[PDB]
Every structure is written in C-alpha cells, then in structure tokens.
C-alpha cells in the first residue's frame, strides 16, 4: 500500500475499534443511568458489561496495533488488581494487553461491582418493604381512650414485621446479598469469601449463614427482630384489639423502635455509598478504555 492513508490500522481493525467505542459508551451510559434497584435493571447492567467485554476480546483477537504510551497507559490502569474481593490494586505485547484489560475489567465488573449491584438491589427491596409497613403506623396508633395513654395495634404491627423478617429469613435469590443468586439452586461461597465481603460491606456476623457446602451473606435481620422482641415486650394486647399503655411506656418503646429503624437506615447508607464508589471505580476504568481507543483512532498519517 503506497497510497496515503489516515491510520496504520486496518479497515477490519477500524471496524473493531469503532464497535468497541460504541459498546464502551453504551455500557458507560447504561451503567450511569440504570440504577441497581431491580433484578431486570441488574441484568441490563450485566449485559452492557458483557458486550463491552466481547468488544474487547474482538480487539485482542483482531490483534489491533497500539502505541507505546497507549500500551503503558492501558497496562498501568488495569494490571495487578482484584485481590481478596477487596479493592487491592516487562515488554508486554499488544495482543497480550487487550487480553489483560478484557480479563481484569471483567473480574471487577463481576466479582466486585456485580456484587454491590446485587447487594443494593436486595437491600433496597428489603428496606422498601420495611418502609411500607412503617406507613401503616397511621391507623395503628391512636391516643389513649382517656387522657394520657396510647393504643398500639401491636398485633398487626407485629404480624407485618414478622412476615418481613420471615421472608428475608429464607435463603433464596431474593434474600442473599452474596454471592449473587444466578439460576435455580442456591449459590454458596467459601467462608473466607463470605467473611471477606462481610467486612467489605461492614456487616455483622449475623448476616453470615451457612448453606450446605458453603456460606452466604444475607441482609441484617437483627433490627427488625429486636423490634418484634420489644413489641412482644409491651405485654400481650387487650382481648383482640389494641394494647393500651401509658406515656412513659409508649415513649420508651417508640424511641427504641426508632433506634432500630435508624440502624437499618445506617446499614443501607453504607451499602449504597460503597456501591457508589464501586460503580465509580469501574467507570474510571471505562474512561481509560475510551481514552485509549480514542487515541488509537487519531489521524496517524
């Protein structure tokens, strides 16, 4: 080829670089606009990453050239990471580096981000449910028949709470934070792994539960369960109606009920913030990617 061109890349190379940029961006847009709040949503995030992965393999497979800086840039940002499902972290060829990028980014997208997504999706759904019960408090609290007393429909409150605790007490694909429950038939992890993610999510050991050959991490039911305990503690209700109690008794019970609600709120917040940092971390990798692919298309003629 003695005719002037705009790039040392091949037409077949350019097609790959192009599709990669497409996937990279569609991925980045998907991951930034679709929150991990529903199972369907997570499927789309997961998909966007898989397609971004494929695009990368195509690049590596195609053996698409790469300048020195591009190689070192890509290398640096992607090499030597993913240790302990924590965040921890020569002349390497071009085909070799795409494979690395394709390998590592996928690990992060799955073993890390993917977990956080699933965590926020489960914890979200879980707190939502608790919120809904909480909105029924209206028709469950009425001032005392005479003067200073208050009637609490302890029974209905307790029933609801219990159903909630009962639902998430099971071990299925709607109550497991880690590992993510893909498919039919419970997915367990080793205890070391279970405990790693337990630390990562700053969750109590109670969230750790065994299932056959392995372990899984669930939501934290301690708060809800203390709530039920206290309700049981107010003493058996009236005949079949509500339980009456004076102010002191009621005041103390309520503050406690708020303390427990407050607890879930704090767990949840730590989870979403941590999810955020994960998602961000992944995005920065996707930026480096788009940045390298962009530099690779620059008119080098």
Swiss-Prot record:
Indicate the principal place this protein occupies in or around the cell.
secreted
The record's domain comment reads: The N-terminal domain is an intra-molecular chaperone that prevents premature oligomerization of the residues on the coiled-coil region that are involved in interactions with the needle and/or itself. The residues in the C-terminal domain probably form oligomeric structures at the tip of the needle that are responsible for the regulation of secretion of other effectors.
Q: Does the keyword Cell membrane apply?
A: no
Family assignment from sequence similarity: Belongs to the invasin protein D family.
GO CC annotations, alphabetized: extracellular region
Coiled-coil residues: 258-285
State what this protein does: Required for translocation of effector proteins via the type III secretion system SPI-1, which is essential for an efficient bacterial internalization. Probably acts by modulating the secretion of SipA, SipB, and SipC.
Q: Which Pfam families match?
A: T3SS_TC
Q: Which organism is it from?
A: Salmonella typhimurium (strain LT2 / SGSC1412 / ATCC 700720)
Compartment list:
Secreted
The stated induction of this gene product is:
Transcriptionally regulated by SicA and InvF. Also regulated by InvE.
Is-annotated flag, keyword Coiled coil?
yes
Q: Which NCBIfam families match?
A: PRK15330.1, SipD_IpaD_SspD
At the top level, the lineage of the source is: Bacteria
Tell me which UniProt keywords the record has, alphabetically: Coiled coil, Secreted, Virulence
Q: Kindly provide the name given to this protein in its UniProt entry.
A: Cell invasion protein SipD
